Structures are given as C-alpha cells and as structure tokens.
C-alpha cells in the first residue's frame, strides 16, 4: 500500500538476482537499457505467479478485501 | 554487421573520385566488389545496414572513410550520405584502446622477422596484416618499386590516381584484414563479454553489452575528427608580421653577436648547435657543474642563467644569447620549421591540427602537424601575439559576415580533485571537502610544512608523480636531506594518501627488491582499471599514481567534451561553421570552441559546466568537479 507496484517489483527483481537495484545508481541505468532487465524479468515473473496491488490512493477496507478475494 | 574498406584518389583534403570498395556481410558470409560506376549502389548497401539497425566496420573510417563518403556523395552523386555515429565502428580506434600495450609485446615479434620495422608502432591495416598472417603483399611497396624499375619515378602517393584490377584486389585485401582484426578485438573478453557474439547483433545491443570505454572511444574519435575538419581559424598576416620582427631581431643580434667574438679550418659560428656556447664559455673561464650521460656539458636555460664570468662583455652577452635561442624557437615553430604553422594553413584560413584520441597509453590525446597543444602561452615572450593568431575572430561568418567569438572552458583543478576522489575512501571525503573549502595549496603547505604556498603548489604535483628526494629538496634550496623529511612529513599529516597505495598494492601486485644500486621494481599486475573499465598498463609501482590520476582526469574530459556537444545538439545548437559553434582544439582539461554570437558562447560555458557535473554524477565521483569559462575573440583571451 505504501509503494507503487513498480517499486515493489523493483525490490523483487533485485532480490531475485542477489543484488540491490536501489543503491548502485550507474548500474541501474546500465543493466536495464542494455538487455539484462528483459532477461531477468522473463526469468522471474515469466511463470505468471506474482500479483501485486496498484493504487497508493488510500484503499477502503471493503475496497481491499474485494480485490484480495479477487 | 558488415565489414568494408574503400579506395579513393587522394586524402581528405583533395579527394575527388571513389575507386572501389568491398562489403563482407556476416549474414551472407560472402564478399561484394564495387567499381567506380557502382559507387551509387555502394552507398545504398551501407544505408541498408543502417535501416536494419546493424553496424558498419571500417578501419580509420571515423577520421577518413566516413567523412570522405560524405564528401564524395556530394560532388559525384549530388546526394547527402551520412552514416550515424551509433551504427558505425572503427577498428583502428579499438586497436588503440584494447592493445595500447603491444609494442611492448612486439619486441619478440620484431626479433621474429614477422613484423616490418617501418610498421613498428603502427595500428594501420598493413601493420596488422602481418600480425594476422593475412598479408599476401602490400600495395604501397609493390607500386613504388615498379615505378623505379619499370620506368618513370614518382613523388608521394600516385598509386591511387585511377582504378586498377590490382587495386580492386588489394581493396579486398584491406577488408579481410579488417574483418580478422575485428574478430581479434572481439575475442578480448575484458571489453567484449563471451556470452554475446558481437558479430551478429544490433547497434543498440553492441554499445550496451560492451565496456563503457568502447562506447566513449567511438564517440570521442568521431567528435575529435569533426574538430580537425572544423579546424582552428588562423591570422596568417599576423604571424608573418612577427617573422619580420623576429628575423630582423635575429639578424641584428647575429650581427651584434659577432661583435663580442671573435673566431684545415675556417670560422663562422653563431648561436646554435652545442659547439657554440660551449666553445666560447670555455674561453670566458666557465667551469661546467652539471654534465650529461654522453659527457658533453649541460647548456640549457637553467645553467645559462647562472653562468658567471670575469669578462663583463662575455657576461652581458649571455643574456643576448638567451634571447637568440628563444627567438629561434618561436621562429622554428611558426615559420622556420618542417611542421611550422604557416605551412599548415589551408585555403580556408584555418589550421587543421590532427589529434590521435586515446591512442596514448592512458588519457590525453597526441597532437602534431602542427602540435596545437604546445603553442607558447601568454606568460612566455611573444606568446601573446602567438595565441592571438589562434582565434574565432580570424574566421568571419559565412552568412552574417561577423567575426565569430571564442569560448574557453577548462577543468578547474582536475588533477587534485581526481586525487581527492581516490583518497576519499580512507578519510571519508576529508581531502575532497578541502578542495571545495578552497585553498588546498594552503593545507598542503601546512601538511608538508612549506614556507610559501607557491612552494606547496610545486611540491604537490612533483611528489605525486614520483620525484626524487633531491628534486623535492631543491624547492626550498636543499637536497635529499630536507627532501626526504619533507615527503615523510606530508605523508604523516595526510594518512589517506599512504592508505591509497595500500589498496593499490593490495589489488594485488608482486614485491620489489634492491640489488646494489639497481631499481628492480617488479610487479604481478601491470594494469590498472580505469573509470570506464579499460586496461591502463601503467608502469612500475614507483609512481603509478600519476597514471591513475591522469587516466581519471583525461577520461573525465573525454566524456566531458562528448556530453557537452551532445547537450548542445540536444539544446538545438548546430555543430559546424555553418551552424552555431565549432570545436577548435582540445588541450588536456581545456577546450576552445568557436561561436557565431557572444550569446551562443554563453550557453556553451553553462553547458560545459552542466556536462562536467553529469560526468561526476555518472561515475559517482567522491569529489566535486567544476569548470570556468572565459569569453573572447582569440586564445590569448580565453586563457
């Protein structure tokens, strides 16, 4: 709830590849635009297993449980 | 990716017709030959590789082939032909990058008799053909000897005046060595990772999967080649108006310098050639102090200032000789030289000083014909006139007719800030903030205990670059006694510097040992990683620091001058004398940019600073980098 879906994915992506894509700032722009992002992305989320919540615009209780049940 | 090489009638200055060219495609795995009527189809084949997003392989193409194909397409086919910088590669540049250390290695190859002595140091195609074993013969020598023996002599390059079926075959010969040299460079995994076959990828992937230095070098060589074609506007009349004032001064002095003396033999001596001052001072009663390795006494500017003789006329004549030698130097650089400036002024009124990019072990390029990076400064005699001759004001605008304005921007204290970056790892940015706080020469003075700040300035650079203890002691008028204690005291007050040589020595290396007065400094690792990741073979651990900092400083400037122009193009300005600005000269940490209006120069100055901060941000520099700009007509004002 406290971070966009891209930010939680950002953590997951780095975590899978045993790295921190939040502190190495030259490497962030490099490995993504070169072809190592698409590589890891398919390597990780390709199994269609990961699902996230996208809003950050203060969800209501039965505007979350509905989505959580979904 | 395709590999090619061309054949023209002459050099970039007066090339008029395209002869032949061969294109080997890695997808088709077959060569294609073109002839002087197939020039049109040749330009199409290169565009097709651009449309697919591939690469075009040339040897010396960034400096010659590509701009020549730009020039040839305008006068012969009346079509605009321009290869983008992103989808063209120059093996010659990569050769200077990957194998800067090769000769060196060539000593055994030179002894082998495999590699010609005239190609001892050349990165040229012919020099590489024997290295790959692909040289079946050279077109340069098989023509010259045919001019002697089979009739009619020759002067300078006539084997290109017109096409011949042997040229069409030696055009292929130039291509297959280019292909093999490319694969020899792609097989070096320090720059090109093995997981990617660069012989079969798109241009977007090639730059990104390669080492950062690879990308910079092609941007650097492309940029500097533009500067050569931009050239430096030159006031011919002014230098001519100086040669008159100097030759007259030389002639009047020559007359006067025969008034004090006084000389199977004859006699005519004048102030030149070591047999001159040596022959007279050993008659005025001068005992030489410092000698040379051959035995001859030292006769330089240093000792001449201190030469004291009992003869007042001889003594007063010393200062007259001091002037004479200096007069010859300026004359010998601007008029009376084989590479004099007046000889290189083209028909446009500009001097096109050439530049070999990172074809120089570590960082800063090399300049020659003429060396634009050794014009006497404003602080030296007659340099004010000299620097004034190199100015944007000496080139009027092809449209408005106005004198362009020059913008001079240098890297503020680049050397010490690079030092602050590598030592901020041990003092947590202490020394780096001392730069920003200002008066780093004041702190170095206190740290090394020097009487004046100027003594600290001359100390910090000499000490950093591996100076003896005598030379350090001579700063305060002493020897190795004060020198050893001056350096040891500086190390104690600046721990980070010593700890820096730990991390370097723990990278790791070997160990050294002295045997009876011989420096036997061995090593295990003779290659330092740069900021872009290139190999910097450096030297013995006795200094090495100088190479690390100068590699850092010059590679920063390379990115700096690249990012500035990219932003200027991004901001909308146009590069070229028909545009708004033009790169004229790059000197270590300073550049000279011609500008159509004063307003444009102001943006250039700000843009140059913006690029310098981006470079510092890109490589996560531990210390802050900055620049200072100066606006004016010529070089004597912008520096």
Rounded Cα distance between B9 and B18, Å, is 7
- Backbone breaks in chain B (C–N > 2.5 Å) follow which residues? 263
Q: Do A25 and B620 touch (CB under 8 A)?
A: yes
Determine the distance in angstroms separating the CA of B547 from the nearest CA of chain A, rounded to an integer.
Answer: 24
DSSP string spanning chain A? --S-HHHHHHHHHHHHTTS-TTT-HHHHHHHHHHTHHHHHHHHHHTTS--------S---GGGTHHHHH-
Q: Do B208 and A30 touch (CB under 8 A)?
A: yes
Q: Do B208 and A25 touch (CB under 8 A)?
A: no
Rounded Cα distance between B179 and B177, Å, is 5
Pair of tokens at residue B306:
């201190």
B163-198 burial: b if 16+ Cβ within 10 Å, else e: bbeebbebbbbbbbbbbbbbebbbeeeebbeeebeb
Residue B58 sits in the same domain as residue B130: yes
Nearest Cβ partner of B205 from A25, A30, A35?
Answer: A35
Burial (CB count <10 Å: 0-12, 13-18, 19+), residue B65: buried
| Residues in A touching B208 (Cβ below 8 Å) | 30, 33-35
Nearest Cβ partner of B620 from A26, A30, A33?
Answer: A26
CATH number at residue B435: 1.10.150.20
Residue B94 sits in the same domain as residue B228: yes
CATH number at residue B268: 1.20.1060.10
Q: Of the residues B349, B371, B403, which one is the last residue of a structural domain?
A: B349
The DSSP output letter for B575 is B
Is-contact B387 B377, C-beta < 8 A? yes
Residue B448 sits in the same domain as residue B407: no
Residue B132 sits in the same domain as residue B64: yes
Q: Of the residues B208, B232, B256, which one is the last residue of a structural domain?
A: B232
**Chain A within 8 Å of B197 (Cβ-Cβ)?**
no
**Chain A within 8 Å of B209 (Cβ-Cβ)?**
yes
Is-contact B228 B353, C-beta < 8 A? yes
Residue B356 sits in the same domain as residue B448: no
Determine the distance in angstroms separating the CA of B433 from the nearest CA of chain A, rounded to an integer.
Answer: 22
**Chain A within 8 Å of B620 (Cβ-Cβ)?**
yes
Is-contact B469 B487, C-beta < 8 A? yes
Residue B141 sits in the same domain as residue B103: yes
Which strands form B581-587's sheet, in the order they lie side by side? B581-587, B590-595, B405-411, B627-632
The DSSP output letter for B402 is P
| Residues in B touching A33 (Cβ below 8 Å) | 208
Residue B482 sits in the same domain as residue B395: no
Dihedral, A20, A23, A25, A30 alpha carbons, nearest 10: 0
Rg of the Cα trace of chain B? 28
Nearest Cβ partner of B208 from A25, A26, A34?
Answer: A34
Backbone angles phi, psi at B326, to 5 degrees: -65, -40
Residue B358 sits in the same domain as residue B286: no
Q: Give the dihedral sign, CA B575/B577/B580/B585.
A: positive
Is-contact A68 A1, C-beta < 8 A? no
Pair of tokens at residue B588:
């270590």
Determine the distance in angstroms separating the CA of B388 from the nearest CA of chain A, rounded to an integer.
Answer: 42
Residue B360 sits in the same domain as residue B485: no
| Domain interval for residue B557 | 350-412+525-639
Q: Of the residues B177, B200, B232, which one is the last residue of a structural domain?
A: B232
Measured in whole angstroms, how far is the alpha carbon of residue B196 from the centre of its chain? 33
Rounded Cα distance between B467 and B453, Å, is 19
Residue B262's CB is within 10 A of a number of other CB atoms, namely 11
Residue B302's CB is within 10 A of a number of other CB atoms, namely 9
Nearest of B326, B363, B355, B337 to residue B536 by alpha carbon: B363
Q: Domain tally for chain B? A: 4
CATH number at residue B571: 3.30.70.370
Q: Where are the beta strands (DSSP E) in B486-624?
A: 528-529, 535-536, 581-587, 590-595
On the question of a cis peptide bond just before residue A41, with omega within 30 degrees of 0, the verdict is: no
Alpha-helical regions (H) of B335-407: 341-344, 383-389
Residue B221 sits in the same domain as residue B241: no
Residue B401's CB is within 10 A of a number of other CB atoms, namely 7
Those residues of chain A whose CB sits closer than 8 Å to some CB in chain B are 25-26, 30, 33-35
Residue B87 sits in the same domain as residue B216: yes
CATH number at residue B126: 3.30.420.10
Residue B571 sits in the same domain as residue B557: yes
């Amino acid at each position: 709830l406290e971070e966009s879906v891209e930010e939680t994915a950002e953590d997951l992506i780095g975590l899978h590849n045993r790295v921190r894509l939040r502190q190495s700032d030259s490497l962030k722009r490099e490995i993504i635009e070169n072809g190592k992002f698409d590589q890891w992305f398919d390597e990780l989320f390709g199994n269609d297993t990961f699902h996230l919540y996208d809003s950050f615009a203060e969800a209501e209780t039965d505007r979350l449980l509905a989505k959580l049940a979904y | 990716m395709i590999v090619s090489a061309i054949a023209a009638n002459a050099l970039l200055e007066s090339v008029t017709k395209f002869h032949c060219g061969v294109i080997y495609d890695y997808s088709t795995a077959e060569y294609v030959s073109y002839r002087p009527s197939d020039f049109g189809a040749y330009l199409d084949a290169l565009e097709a590789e651009v449309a697919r997003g591939g690469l075009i392989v040339f040897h010396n193409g960034h400096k010659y082939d590509v701009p020549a194909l730009t020039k040839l397409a305008k006068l012969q086919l009346n079509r605009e032909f321009h290869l983008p910088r992103e989808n063209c590669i120059d093996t010659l540049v990569l050769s200077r990058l990957i194998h800067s250390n090769l000769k060196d290695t060539d000593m055994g190859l030179l002894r082998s008799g495999k590699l010609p002595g005239k190609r001892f140091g050349s990165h040229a195609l012919e020099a590489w053909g024997y290295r790959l074993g692909e040289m079946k013969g050279e077109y340069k020598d098989d023509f010259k000897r045919m001019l002697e023996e089979q009739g009619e002599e020759y002067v300078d390059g006539m084997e290109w005046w017109n096409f011949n079926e042997e040229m069409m075959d030696y055009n292929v010969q130039d291509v297959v060595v280019t292909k093999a040299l490319l694969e020899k460079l792609l097989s070096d995994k320090h720059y090109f990772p093995p997981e990617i076959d660069f012989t079969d990828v798109g241009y977007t992937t090639f730059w990104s999967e390669s080492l950062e230095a690879v990308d910079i070098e092609h941007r650097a060589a492309w940029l500097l080649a533009k500067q050569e074609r931009n050239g430096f506007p030159f006031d011919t009349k002014a230098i001519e108006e100086l040669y008159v004032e100097l030759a007259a001064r030389r002639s009047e002095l020559l007359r006067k310098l025969t008034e004090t003396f006084g000389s199977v033999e004859h006699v005519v001596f004048n102030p030149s050639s070591r047999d001159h001052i040596q022959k007279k001072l050993q008659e005025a009663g001068w005992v030489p102090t410092k000698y040379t390795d051959k035995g001859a006494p030292v006769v330089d500017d240093e000792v001449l200032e201190g030469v004291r003789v009992d003869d007042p006329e001889k003594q007063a004549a010393i200062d007259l000789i001091k002037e004479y030698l200096m007069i010859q130097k300026r004359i010998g650089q601007s008029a009376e030289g084989d590479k004099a400036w007046l000889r290189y002024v083209a028909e446009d009124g500009k001097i096109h000083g050439s530049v070999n990019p990172n074809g120089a072990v570590t960082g800063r390029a090399t300049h020659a014909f003429p060396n634009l990076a050794q014009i006497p400064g404003v602080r030296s005699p007659y340099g004010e006139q000299c620097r004034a001759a190199f100015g944007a004001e000496h080139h009027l605008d092809g449209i408005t007719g106005k004198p362009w304005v020059q913008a001079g921007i240098d890297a503020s204290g680049l050397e010490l800030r690079c030092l602050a970056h590598f030592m901020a790892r041990f003092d947590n940015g202490e020394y780096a903030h001392e730069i920003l706080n200002g008066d780093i020469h004041t702190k170095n003075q206190i740290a090394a205990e020097l009487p004046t700040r100027d003594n600290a300035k001359t100390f910090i650079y000499g000490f950093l670059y591996g100076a003896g203890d005598e030379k350090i002691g001579q700063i305060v008028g002493a020897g190795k006694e004060r020198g050893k204690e001056l350096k040891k005291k500086f190390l104690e007050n600046t721990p980070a510097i010593a700890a820096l040589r730990e991390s370097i020595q723990q990278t790791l290396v070997e160990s050294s040992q002295w045997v009876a007065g011989e420096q036997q400094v061995k090593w295990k690792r003779r290659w330092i990683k740069g900021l872009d990741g290139r190999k910097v073979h450096v030297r013995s651990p006795h200094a090495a620091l100088n190479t690390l900092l100068q590699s850092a400083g010059a590679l920063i400037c390379k990115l700096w001058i690249i990012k500035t122009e990219e932003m200027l193009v991004e901001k909308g300005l146009k590069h070229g004398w028909d545009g708004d600005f033009a790169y004229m000269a790059w000197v270590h940490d300073e550049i000279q940019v011609g500008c159509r209006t004063e307003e444009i120069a102001q943006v250039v100055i700000e843009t140059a600073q913006e690029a310098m901060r981006w470079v510092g941000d890109h490589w996560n520099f531990r210390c802050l980098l900055d620049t200072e700009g100066k606006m004016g007509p010529n070089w004597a004002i912008c520096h």
